[PDB]
């Protein structure tokens, strides 16, 4: 929740750690309850969508996420979007109810 | 107002007008009447879209000849906000003169922007979009229903619809914005995709990205439709190179051509099946194909081929089938043992790097396919296809790749080169070899664009220097020149960073990214900035890659806990929809006063069109030299290509291509002459790049802030920042910054 | 099984050294340290459950792709393309003949990989390498 | 494990031979403590 990148050299607590499959469910709940159409003029996903097409040189490695040797994610990735979602959360409470 | 040109009466839609547009608008009318290409470079803070629609829309209304006008842009955004821009014009225009001109204005994009289909528009690729699109409107559905209509083929509502009517009344005279297109398409149940691309010929202007131009695979539909005297405007074209390159250019994977061989055991299946039961169709394909006939003529307008035109349209060869690809199973066969020399030409132990004739040479040598055959694989594939009754394509859809290697590899020579690399990952702990095909000459795909069209604008806020452009793409301009904005108070501060508080020297080098010196430093330039900003901080990396590690490091180091104080973090992602909803979030905080900081790649989807005006962006922290990944088998061959035939040098060409990113992200903060910010190049790199940033920008770099501190960057941002917020004095900037009719007419008095 | 020989059975991971060869006549698949046992002495049948032809070891050669039956379409090809070669100039210019030629060498591979009618394709072969 | 490695088998073993065994004012007696580094 704070953000750290988890080290599995650290051991934890039995108790807790049986609620991070459910936080992983809440997380795509949380994502599903912050999405919602775009306006057309800052809509990102229609640039790349201009030409579904485009057949070009793929990008280098400095332009992609991160991976380790076994090539699945480094993870470093999760964070970025934990801290965004954050964002996202605590400005979508402002326009509460009230 | 309504001011006058030499002959022109155009129309403004402000009381008031800058110097610059003015004198913008009186070059660009040159340009066209005398005729040619122009290169014309002006400030972001002066309004330029305003500025070209305004005179090109009066030139054709006035003149007699009422020549069309192609506007082209570099993302689907800018085509809204130009069309909101000709919106406003028409309708200044309209109350002005008393009724509405006869005058149509679209915009044009993929299916995937414009499919009211409920069904089919809740996709999460176009290719998608576009198979099903198309299985309801290729037209087999429709026969099929005629001869039995208890066929259970479907069909789609607003496409039928659009029958009933014709195709000069599926919208009434006007501008219609993608907002506005959309909500007058789903009351009236019509498909605006099909609207728009119907309706081509019959707009007065015609708004589209450069995609739709270059890129073969789509441009030879629309360029079809346009006219060849209409006016073409190329709108933040500094990097239009790029878009020319990628054009033509092509990628397999070990994977690719793994799926490849399905597809080819697939159609030989599918040809077998169709054989026993249904042999008709393949003699009455082979009947057309021996007479000489070309997906053109056997294809109907209704349906389009399997496999895009992946060269330009005058490459290909106008003559008959060579025979050995004439029937079904032959050219299986021929496609077939084709895939299997690629796969054993990736089993390469070092990176091999050869020209398409030696490619060719090769295959010509271990199996024996000509070049001709290869040039017609692609038109062979997709009236192949057509005839096999392959409503499912999802087998046959990696045969494209290879479809498209054959064609690419076997009609160009010059210009190209192949890469064959056993590592596409170093950093893996098997081999994964990746065969690249490239486009080095970024000529090639504009240069028909240049010769169909007589009169071509580019313009830019940050195309500089201009003299490069007519070097690295063959054309010449009948004039090319830089504006500087007549600004009475200094709107925007740009500072250079070469070291921190202190005193180290800092820099983003790929090599040194993991440094706790330079992590640190930068770190605290973050911080420090976020302090003193209003309202909004927009942060540019390198790639994204320098950006997640360096973010990781300022988490551990508790460097983020400080900046959570007085900012949100917003990030950008891989994923376009996660982007596009941080950018909502990141403006709805600006807005509210919360206060927001966003970290964005300096090459990423948020650079290439996304402006922060005004409150949104008041702070650009340039995290070192957007340089590219130097040690890239793609990069090292355009350069020495470049050297060769352009005689452009290795590292001038590699300084050009960082900075113009850093000067598009440096531009993207200015809307009108009211805006402010403060621009901060944090690198040791920049101190001698002032000469090659844009006019505008170099103009007000200062030689005192050539090399800062981060404490001396620091103390001039807070003032500059409360000099900013006092009053204006009009009387400063009556007539010297913005011109009212009055002062225009004393303008052109003057001058003549 | 896709690394072994079908006959002594010889794992890669134990024997490293181990080259795979390949016969034109039958096209099956045969671990080196066979070849020599088996062959070295003279002519002998192949060592195949359901394949009686036979061979000799000096035609045996490495496989070049890794599918069997682009390879016999491609050394077919190659036997072809020994006798019925042709160029443009050789019809004066008429592309209608030459693609009509390459039609008829084409489907001539067509049958013979197939087998469709073996021994009036090959008498066809035959009696044009003489002209 | 060296004929392993000749027959061309990885050998999960190493060769035994091959691992490496690894003044004035005293009237202050003890008030000193040494400082000597930082
Ligand atoms: S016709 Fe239009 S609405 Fe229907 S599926 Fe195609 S793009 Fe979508
Ligand atoms: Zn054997
Ligand atoms: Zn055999």
Redesign the pocket.
């Given at each position: 929740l704070r953000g750290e990148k988890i080290m599995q050299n650290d051991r934890g607590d039995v108790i807790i750690d049986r609620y991070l499959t459910l936080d992983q469910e809440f997380d795509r709940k949380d994502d599903d309850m912050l999405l919602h159409p775009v306006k057309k003029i800052i809509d990102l996903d229609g640039n790349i969508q201009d030409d579904p097409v485009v057949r070009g040189n793929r990008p280098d490695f400095t332009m992609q996420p991160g991976v380790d040797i076994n090539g699945n994610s480094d993870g470093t990735v999760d964070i970025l979007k934990g801290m965004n979602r954050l964002s996202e959360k605590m400005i979508m409470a402002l326009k509460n109810e009230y | 107002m309504k001011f006058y040109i030499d002959d022109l009466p155009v129309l403004f839609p402000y009381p008031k007008i800058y110097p610059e547009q003015y004198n913008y608008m009186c070059d660009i009318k040159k340009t066209l009447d005398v005729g040619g290409n122009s290169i014309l470079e002006m400030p972001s803070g002066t309004g330029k879209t305003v500025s070209l629609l305004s005179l090109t829309i009066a030139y054709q209304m006035h003149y007699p000849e009422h020549r069309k006008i192609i506007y082209c842009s570099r993302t689907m955004s800018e085509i809204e906000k130009a069309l909101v821009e000709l919106e406003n014009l028409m309708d200044y225009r309209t109350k002005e003169l008393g009724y509405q001109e006869d005058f149509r204005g679209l915009g044009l994009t993929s299916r995937k922007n414009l499919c009211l289909h409920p069904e089919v528009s809740k996709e999460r690729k176009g290719t998608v979009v576009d198979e099903k699109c198309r299985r309801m409107t290729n037209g087999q559905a429709k026969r099929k229903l005629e001869e039995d209509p208890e066929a259970n083929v479907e069909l789609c509502e607003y496409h039928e619809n659009l029958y009933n009517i014709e195709v000069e009344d599926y919208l009434p005279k006007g501008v219609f914005s993608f907002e506005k297109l959309l909500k007058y398409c789903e009351e009236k149940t019509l498909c605006p995709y099909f609207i728009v691309r119907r309706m081509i010929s019959l707009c007065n202007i015609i708004i589209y990205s450069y995609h739709y131009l270059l890129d073969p695979k789509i441009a030879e539909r629309v360029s079809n439709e346009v006219s060849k005297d209409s006016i073409v405007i190329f709108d933040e074209a500094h990097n239009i190179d790029n878009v020319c390159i990628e054009s033509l250019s092509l990628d397999l994977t070990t994977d690719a051509l793994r799926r490849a061989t399905r597809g080819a055991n697939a159609l030989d299946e599918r040809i077998s099946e169709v054989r026993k039961v249904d042999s008709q169709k393949l003699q009455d394909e082979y009947e057309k194909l021996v007479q000489g006939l070309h997906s053109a003529d056997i294809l109907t307008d209704q349906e389009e081929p399997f496999v895009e035109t992946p060269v330009l349209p005058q490459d290909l060869l106008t003559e008959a089938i060579p025979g050995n690809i004439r029937r079904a199973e032959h050219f299986v066969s021929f496609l077939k043992r084709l895939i299997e020399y690629l796969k054993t030409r990736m089993k390469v132990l070092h990176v091999i790097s050869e020209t398409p004739k030696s490619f060719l040479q090769h295959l010509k040598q271990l199996t024996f396919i000509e070049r001709k055959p290869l040039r017609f694989c692609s038109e062979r594939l997709s009236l192949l296809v057509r005839t096999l009754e392959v409503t499912e394509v999802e087998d046959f859809t990696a045969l494209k790749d290879i479809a498209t290697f054959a064609t690419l590899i076997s009609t160009y020579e010059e210009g190209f080169l192949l890469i064959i690399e056993p590592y596409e990952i170093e950093n893996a702990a098997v081999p994964n070899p990746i065969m690249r095909f490239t486009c080095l000459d970024a000529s090639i795909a504009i240069k028909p664009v240049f010769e169909r069209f007589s009169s071509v604008i580019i313009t830019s806020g940050t195309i500089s220097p201009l003299d490069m452009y007519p070097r690295m793409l063959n054309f010449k301009t009948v004039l090319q020149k830089s504006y500087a904005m007549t600004l009475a108070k200094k709107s925007f501060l740009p500072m250079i960073i070469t070291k921190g508080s202190d005193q180290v020297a800092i820099s983003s080098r790929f090599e040194i990214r993991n440094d706790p010196s330079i992590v640190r430093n930068y770190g605290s330039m973050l911080v420090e900035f976020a302090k003193i900003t209003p309202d909004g901080m927009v942060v540019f990396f390198p790639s994204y890659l320098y950006m997640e590690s360096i973010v990781s490091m300022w988490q551990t180091m508790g460097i983020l806990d400080e900046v959570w104080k007085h900012k949100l973090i917003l990030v950008e992602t891989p994923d376009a929809q996660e982007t596009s909803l941080a950018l909502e979030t990141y403006r709805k905080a600006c807005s509210n006063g919360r206060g927001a900081i966003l970290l964005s790649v300096a090459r990423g989807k948020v650079s290439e069109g996304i402006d922060f005006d005004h409150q949104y962006g008041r702070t650009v922290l340039m995290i070192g030299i957007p340089f590219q990944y130097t040690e890239s088998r793609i990069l090292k061959a355009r350069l020495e290509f470049m050297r060769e035939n352009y005689r452009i040098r290795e590292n001038d060409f590699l300084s050009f291509d960082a900075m113009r990113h850093a000067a598009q992200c440096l531009g993207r903060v200015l809307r009108g002459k009211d805006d402010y910010g403060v621009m901060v190049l944090a690198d040791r790199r920049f101190s001698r790049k002032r000469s090659q940033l844009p006019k505008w920008i170099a103009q007000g770099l200062s030689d005192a802030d050539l090399n800062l501190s981060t404490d001396m960057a620091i103390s001039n941002t807070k003032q500059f920042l409360r000099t900013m917020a006092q009053p204006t004095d009009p009387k400063d900037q009556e007539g010297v910054s913005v011109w009212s009719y009055e002062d225009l007419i004393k303008h052109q008095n003057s001058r003549k | 099984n896709k690394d072994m020989?079908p006959?002594?059975?010889?794992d890669r991971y134990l024997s490293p050294d181990?080259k795979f060869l390949v016969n034109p006549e039958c096209y099956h698949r045969?671990?080196e340290?066979?070849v020599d046992r088996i062959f070295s002495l003279g002519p002998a049948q192949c060592p195949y459950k359901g394949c009686d032809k036979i061979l000799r070891k000096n035609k045996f050669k490495t496989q070049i792709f890794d599918d069997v039956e682009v390879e016999k379409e491609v050394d077919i090809r190659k036997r072809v393309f020994n006798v019925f070669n042709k160029t443009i100039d050789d019809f004066n210019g008429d592309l209608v003949e030459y693609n009509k030629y390459l039609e008829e060498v084409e489907d001539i591979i067509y049958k013979l990989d197939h087998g469709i009618d073996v021994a009036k394709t090959e008498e066809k072969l035959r009696t044009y390498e003489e002209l | 494990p060296r004929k392993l490695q000749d027959l061309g088998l990885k050998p999960a073993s190493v060769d035994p031979a091959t691992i490496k065994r690894q003044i004035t004012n005293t009237h202050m007696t003890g008030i000193l403590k040494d400082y000597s580094h930082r």
């Open positions: - | - | 020989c006959i002594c059975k010889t181990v045969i671990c340290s066979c | -």
